[PDB]
Amino acid sequence: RHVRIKNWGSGMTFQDTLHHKAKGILTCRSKSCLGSIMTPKSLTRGPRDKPTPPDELLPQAIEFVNQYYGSFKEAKIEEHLARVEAVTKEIETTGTYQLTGDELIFATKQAWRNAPRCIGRIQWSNLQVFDARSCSTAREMFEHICRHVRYSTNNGNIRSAITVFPQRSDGKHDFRVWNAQLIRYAGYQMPDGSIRGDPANVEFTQLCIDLGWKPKYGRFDVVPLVLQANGRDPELFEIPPDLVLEVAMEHPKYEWFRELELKWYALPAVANMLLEVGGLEFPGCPFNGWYMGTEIGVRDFCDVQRYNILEEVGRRMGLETHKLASLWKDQAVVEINIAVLHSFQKQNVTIMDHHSAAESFMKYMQNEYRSRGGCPADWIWLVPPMSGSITPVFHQEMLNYVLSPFYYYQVEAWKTHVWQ
């Protein structure tokens, strides 16, 4: 079946066939399309109370092994059979199986390549995998994480990496990081009702306070690492401030921008997602890349539910903040995003503008169809939050579907935890 995909900007046409190997878990039906649901149950992998029944695990395990060995330009016929045989045994004798070191590396990279919402996928093959499946205590998790942070930060020359903690066995012995990101700022609900800091982390900040963390009521306070070792209650750890690289915001023209006293961290490390590989689940697998300007400038800074600094900037710029039609909102957002890119560049830290990112993704998408004839793509997430149609991804028709390996969301640990 050849579902024809077309790019109305360049006339480029694609034939998607890969969508057949997809897992039919999406909620979209013939009567209604719900592609705009942010965090659907379909892309979520809930917690369990008992291991995956060997009956549904086996076919998935083999399916993965086939894909792994099939990825080789060569033909390893023997090793392939030996492994598929070895795994089948392990599942029938232990109820689960372990991935080899190389299979894990292929798994993580392939899952990235399968992330329909990631726009930096042109780098899918360039990832540093840290094996921490041997981990056993929260204290060790902290050390593994600091290793990751020290690496990926790399004195400003950010580089992608991922740390894989021991897979899910019972579902009662989960190894996971509660924090949405390794590095994130605190959010505090102030007495006057307003929120000081990042609104997105108000709830998680409370959890940190309940666990003992002392609030500092600042706008950019780095939240402590809330780590969980095999089902045990989580323990707090403070990322040494030396490892947290930040960039102070400033404009190449508006010297008053410094007055806003803004800043942001350099490392975007999502930490609460789950890696699914041939039936196995890794609830603890923090990964990172480098930032795309708009993520901070448009979203983190101008969302009403985030720092919301838009009006303050429009006023400082002396724009008509009352006449909407003045397009004051659009100028402000642009100057803010310039401040971001500028600041990261003046401080020798890796950042990527949304134009360069988009053009690189087109190159990537093309490679996908030429190689494996398919590319899972969520238009709603790939198109930048500012100047949408000015980028080629806006003009690209795309199919969104779930494959395997894959990075699923999770129900934030605390909401389902069984405290002791």
Next chain:
Amino acid sequence: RHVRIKNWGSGMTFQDTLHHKAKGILTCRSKSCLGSIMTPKSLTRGPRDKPTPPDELLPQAIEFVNQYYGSFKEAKIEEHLARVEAVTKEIETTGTYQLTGDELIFATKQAWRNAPRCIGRIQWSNLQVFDARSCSTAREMFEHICRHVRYSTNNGNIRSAITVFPQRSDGKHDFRVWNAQLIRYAGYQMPDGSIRGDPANVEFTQLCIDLGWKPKYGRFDVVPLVLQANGRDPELFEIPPDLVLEVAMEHPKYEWFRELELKWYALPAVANMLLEVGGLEFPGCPFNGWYMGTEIGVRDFCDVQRYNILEEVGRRMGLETHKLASLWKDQAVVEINIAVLHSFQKQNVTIMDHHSAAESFMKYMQNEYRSRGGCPADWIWLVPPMSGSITPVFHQEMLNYVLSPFYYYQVEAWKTHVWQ
């Protein structure tokens, strides 16, 4: 059954129940979502060569009548019941029916209310209907269209209106305007490969030329109205220039913008669409509203597949047109959109900025849920192509579905029509 959708910017939630009455025709499967396809077959409504079977039409006819009488605040028990039998009898005898003049008024306004891609639906219950089902000749159609244009243009103060041509019967006697829009610039393919004018009209203009139209090889050449009556062959008609209101483009601060010598028509009138009312189809039904700034500024002017003035303006502003990270494209887009709004305000022509548009639609969507417990919406088309996340529609989760009445696309006439 309730499907919950939330707006992450305001926190507000809605419970959609209206999606149950949707016609299951969307191509989104459980395995893959194709909501990013521009003009899918599901939203298209092809040609016929055999009338709609009365067997098949009766349900749809009754359904509309009930929906019609259901709109009234009172109760018209008597007239309702009478109309139901009158229609049943009429379809039984003739094999089709004729909606009353007032029903046509309701249908057009309702189909607008049911257009999931229109962001200006807040104006739904405000439309001027021109009943032209009595029409019989191409010449007549032209006379009707000229009425619509004069009425809607209203010397600057734009007004919404729709002109309904005779309903399809055999499917061999269609009455329709082949033009994508009433007023639209031509596009020529110059001898050096390049394109002069609007690229999106190359094929259409070529047709006009084939039909004896003299290419004026200019940039903003208003292409002739290609009308079709009773399924005959189309006849050319040049819309009287005095009726075509244009707006000269100029910036409030950039004196040199005038030198760009740009302009655009004030009347956005989609002609090539099909209105479906209770099983009946009208291949001819031009409609219009007023422009939203971004349609001209972001799309028509900046698209690579359109006028593509982006680089010219950038160089004109003296921006680093070679360093993407300078965000010159974004600054250029903003000023171009500021020029569009300014030009219209100056010439006293009606236009709406995407910010006022989105905030008005936010109110419309809330009312729809209060009213019918639903509001079909295509996120991908509703979020402005500029500063997406700065508008509330960006943060609004939504369901997209086909109701009735509705405005469907069609297969471009020349692409199917059999020439006499």
